[PDB]
Amino acid sequence: KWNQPSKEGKKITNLFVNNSLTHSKVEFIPQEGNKIKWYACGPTVYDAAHLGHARTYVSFDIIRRILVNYFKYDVFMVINITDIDDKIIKRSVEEKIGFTELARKWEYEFWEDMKSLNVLLPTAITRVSEYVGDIVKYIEKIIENVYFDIDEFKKSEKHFYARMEPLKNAYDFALWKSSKHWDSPWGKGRPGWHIECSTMASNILGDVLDIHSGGIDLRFPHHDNELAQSEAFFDHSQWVNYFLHSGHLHIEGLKMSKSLKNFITIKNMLTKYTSNQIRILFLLNKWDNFMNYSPNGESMVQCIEIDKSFTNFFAIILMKIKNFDLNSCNLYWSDADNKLNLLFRQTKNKIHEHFLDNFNTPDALLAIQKLITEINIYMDKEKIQIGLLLEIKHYINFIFDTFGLIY
Amino acid sequence: PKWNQPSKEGKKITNLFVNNSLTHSKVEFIPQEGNKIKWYACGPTVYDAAHLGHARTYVSFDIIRRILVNYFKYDVFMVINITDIDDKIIKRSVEEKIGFTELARKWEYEFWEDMKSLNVLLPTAITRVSEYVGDIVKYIEKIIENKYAYVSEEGSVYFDIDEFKKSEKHFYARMEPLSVEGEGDLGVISKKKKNAYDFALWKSSKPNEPHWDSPWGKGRPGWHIECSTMASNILGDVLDIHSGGIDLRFPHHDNELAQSEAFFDHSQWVNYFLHSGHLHIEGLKMSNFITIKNMLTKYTSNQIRILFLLNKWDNFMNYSPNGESMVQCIEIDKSFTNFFAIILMKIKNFDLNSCNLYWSDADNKLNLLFRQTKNKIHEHFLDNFNTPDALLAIQKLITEINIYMDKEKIQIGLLLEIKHYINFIFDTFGLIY
Numbered sequence: 022k023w024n025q026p027s028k029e030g031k032k033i034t035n036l037f038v039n040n041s042l043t044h045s046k047v048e049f050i051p052q053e054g055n056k057i058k059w060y061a062c063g064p065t066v067y068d069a070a071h072l073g074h075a076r077t078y079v080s081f082d083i084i085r086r087i088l089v090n091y092f093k094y095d096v097f098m099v100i101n102i103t104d105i106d107d108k109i110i111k112r113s114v115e116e117k118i119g120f121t122e123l124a125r126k127w128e129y130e131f132w133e134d135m136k137s138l139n140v141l142l143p144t145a146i147t148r149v150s151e152y153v154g155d156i157v158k159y160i161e162k163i164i165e166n167v168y169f170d171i172d173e174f175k176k177s178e179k180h181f182y183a184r185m186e187p188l189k190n191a192y193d194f195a196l197w198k199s200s201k202h203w204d205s206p207w208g209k210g211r212p213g214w215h216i217e218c219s220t221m222a223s224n225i226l227g228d229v230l231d232i233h234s235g236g237i238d239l240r241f242p243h244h245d246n247e248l249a250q251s252e253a254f255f256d257h258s259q260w261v262n263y264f265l266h267s268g269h270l271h272i273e274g275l276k277m278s279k280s281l282k283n284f285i286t287i288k289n290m291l292t293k294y295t296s297n298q299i300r301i302l303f304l305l306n307k308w309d310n311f312m313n314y315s316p317n318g319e320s321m322v323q324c325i326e327i328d329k330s331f332t333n334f335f336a337i338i339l340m341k342i343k344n345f346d347l348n349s350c351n352l353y354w355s356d357a358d359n360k361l362n363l364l365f366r367q368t369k370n371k372i373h374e375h376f377l378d379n380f381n382t383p384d385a386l387l388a389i390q391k392l393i394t395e396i397n398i399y400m401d402k403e404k405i406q407i408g409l410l411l412e413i414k415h416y417i418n419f420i421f422d423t424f425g426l427i428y
Numbered sequence: 429p430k431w432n433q434p435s436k437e438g439k440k441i442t443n444l445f446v447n448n449s450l451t452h453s454k455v456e457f458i459p460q461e462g463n464k465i466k467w468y469a470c471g472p473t474v475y476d477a478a479h480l481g482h483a484r485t486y487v488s489f490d491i492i493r494r495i496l497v498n499y500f501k502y503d504v505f506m507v508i509n510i511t512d513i514d515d516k517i518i519k520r521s522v523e524e525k526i527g528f529t530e531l532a533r534k535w536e537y538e539f540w541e542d543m544k545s546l547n548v549l550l551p552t553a554i555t556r557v558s559e560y561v562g563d564i565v566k567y568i569e570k571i572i573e574n575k576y577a578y579v580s581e582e583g584s585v586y587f588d589i590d591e592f593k594k595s596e597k598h599f600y601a602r603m604e605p606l607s608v609e610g611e612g613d614l615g616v617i618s619k620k621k622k623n624a625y626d627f628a629l630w631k632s633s634k635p636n637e638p639h640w641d642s643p644w645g646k647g648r649p650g651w652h653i654e655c656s657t658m659a660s661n662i663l664g665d666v667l668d669i670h671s672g673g674i675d676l677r678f679p680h681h682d683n684e685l686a687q688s689e690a691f692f693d694h695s696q697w698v699n700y701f702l703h704s705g706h707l708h709i710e711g712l713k714m715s716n717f718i719t720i721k722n723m724l725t726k727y728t729s730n731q732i733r734i735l736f737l738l739n740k741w742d743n744f745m746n747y748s749p750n751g752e753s754m755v756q757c758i759e760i761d762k763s764f765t766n767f768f769a770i771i772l773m774k775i776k777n778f779d780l781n782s783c784n785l786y787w788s789d790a791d792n793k794l795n796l797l798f799r800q801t802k803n804k805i806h807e808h809f810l811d812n813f814n815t816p817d818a819l820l821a822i823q824k825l826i827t828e829i830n831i832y833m834d835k836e837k838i839q840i841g842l843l844l845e846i847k848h849y850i851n852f853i854f855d856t857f858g859l860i861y
């Protein structure tokens with residue numbers, strides 16, 4: 022059974038997150054102080070990245086921004102790059118170009134797409150090719166406690182297999198694959214599909230991870246196997262306290278799958294839309310829920326309206342401040358000034374409640390929209406409290422900074 | 429006497445401690461409501477150019493306001509008054525043969541311009557005394573209805589201190605009880621005032637001076653009544669924070685406190701009273717002044733703020749006019765600028781294709797110092813806004829980042845995250861690089 026961390030000496034914000042280990046919304050408690058150790062599964066570098074990747078990394082970029090810029094947690098984040106893999110091998114033979122040269126090509130394009138979307142880079146980037154030796158040492162320790170013996174793993178009282186999805190032996194999975202290459206004590210081989218993530222996360226972050234994230238497709242078999250693998254290495258029972266899984270994205274009602282050729286590259290999207298509009302799209306959909314994207318701008322129409330209204334809001338308010346004259350004005354605190362201020366401080370508490378509610382950005386975005394509507398009337402008709410307008414502009418800048426929006 | 433700490437239930441608790449002048453000690457800070465802080469700060473007297481003493485107080489509280497909001501996420505509602513009608517202004521307006529409003533408007537504009545030059549944020553509300561005179565008269569009417577003030581025949585009103593003390597719920601001069609011997613004051617012998625320590629709420633006006641209509645006759649507000657009136661109307665019966673320089677603790681703030689307790693008839697108008705330390709120039713009180721504008725022809729806004737960051741807001745300070753105190757400030761400003769120049773160039777020219785990103789011991793050592801510095805600085809801010817020790821922490825971290833960037837292979841993501849933390853702290857300090 023999952024054991025929530027103790028609250029003593031830790032930052033307690035009363036934040037709740039959908040934890041796939043509990044299949045429920047639970048309060049988030051750091052393992053140490055205000056520190057959040059966070060490992061996120063990274064992409065497979067054989068292709069251009071598409072909207073499914075963008076949704077996961079932008080959604081967790083938004084979550085990371087909420088945790089750090091808004092709640093003041095101290096976040097240490099690591100993302101791996103899987104540049105050695107069966108799929109990478111096969112694509113290099115179809116294209117008759119080198120496997121490492123191809124992987125380096127699409128990792129560069131991935132990082133260029135992330136910067137185009139204003140996604141912050143993690144603290145550490147762990148490439149599988151640079152960590153193969155540590156992976157081999159990792160397997161050695163599992164044996165001291167190649168294929169994972171699932172039957173032996175369950176037998177232990179301190180270990181439980183498949184904490185997140187209910188469903189020698191067929192259920193055994195490979196840790197090390199025999200070469201059809203790199204040297205190892207057990208023979209030439211390649212890493213298995215899942216062991217790479219468990220190895221790299223353990224070396225940098227250690228025996229306990231505050232958060233582990235990824236898309237929902239990866240929950241089984243990949244993430245459930247990562248949990249079992251890491252518990253076997255350290256010989257303990259909970260390698261990850263909170264597991265966050267983003268929902269799937271369907272384009273025109275079907276899963277993005279290789280055979281369909283239904284993918285939309287991030288670069289193609291960016292020839293028609295801004296980073297702000299693409300982020301607004303993901304802010305409008307809850308990170309933990311599924312989404313349908315209708316291409317050709319059906320889904321982006323609402324996003325573009327919102328982006329346009331934020332841009333105009335800033336044009337007006339900066340002009341009003343610019344033309345404000347302290348000599349010619351009267352600064353009595355009117356009933357209109359006071360009513361706007363109450364809505365301003367109310368909106369602050371609403372957004373706080375929304376972020377605590379599992380990073381409910383769709384409702385926080387609507388809250389900002391309502392506040393902007395009220396400021397617009399105030400600026401048009403009422404006599405303006407220059408200090409109140411400036412203070413409001415800074416709060417909205419702070420929230421847009423938490424969203425990664427740039428105005 | 430007695431102080432009531434706010435209840436902690438349902439409130440934002442950051443474990444911040446502040447030097448509260450009501451207790452003359454450091455007490456935990458608890459908001460009156462949620463995470464909201466209603467804050468009133470006494471403003472300047474607009475008859476002259478502002479000088480370095482005003483700058484120390486308003487910059488020091490600008491730093492605290494940024495710490496409270498940008499770092500701790502309190503929600504701060506701040507009000508500053510402008511005393512644009514006052515005895516000093518009247519005398520200066522007669523000396524210069526210009527109108528009282530024309531003079532006050534000139535030096536209010538120059539005050540806010542000097543504040544803008546130093547990167548001091550404007551408050552939510554700015555309350556000019558001339559715009560609030562009618563509210564002031566209503567405020568006095570209530571003090572009289574509660575029998576804590578009395579009307580002289582000439583047309584003045586005075587606070588009845590003796591009646592105020594008699595109440596069990598009231599104590600006079602809660603913060604400087606001992607500053608309370610004039611003895612044979614001509615006004616007391618005449619029996620106009622009742623006791624010499626009584627002070628005027630409303631002043632019957634002398635000829636050839638501005639005046640306003642009132643129930644007691646044409647007159648002006650007294651020196652202290654203005655701040656109590658204005659703060660109550662916007663913030664209400666309880667103020668989370670009331671700030672000002674230490675010179676104003678008595679009589680100005682103690683009388684402001686007595687007036688507001690009398691109006692509402694309760695015992696604590698202000699939960700936390702913060703008093704900035706004195707600015708001395710060459711070891712003596714500024715009585716030798718330096719205008720803020722003069723300082724800014726010789727030093728940057730960043731350098732002037734580093735000076736106040738180097739001195740704790742609640743402690744006394746010595747300024748050496750021969751540039752002795754600003755020498756260190758200029759060195760620090762120089763090293764922050766260069767650090768940002770270096771770190772920005774290293775980030776720009778980093779190539780993700782050509783690099784290796786194995787997590788080294790060098791990468792890990794910088795990361796550990798990175799997270800250590802975050803916890804140290806957090807503790808310094810909790811310790812009564814100890815900016816001097818937090819600034820030294822940033823300096824030590826910067827020395828190590830400079831070494832890392834030169835020799836070791838750089839983990840770009842760690843360097844970016846470090847730059848963003850330092851950008852975040854410099855925003856909290858009001859520095860701009």
Ligand SMILES: [Zn+2]
Pocket residue numbers: 061062063218243
């Ligand atoms: Zn993975």
Ligand SMILES: [Zn+2]
Pocket residue numbers: 470471655680684
């Ligand atoms: Zn005052």
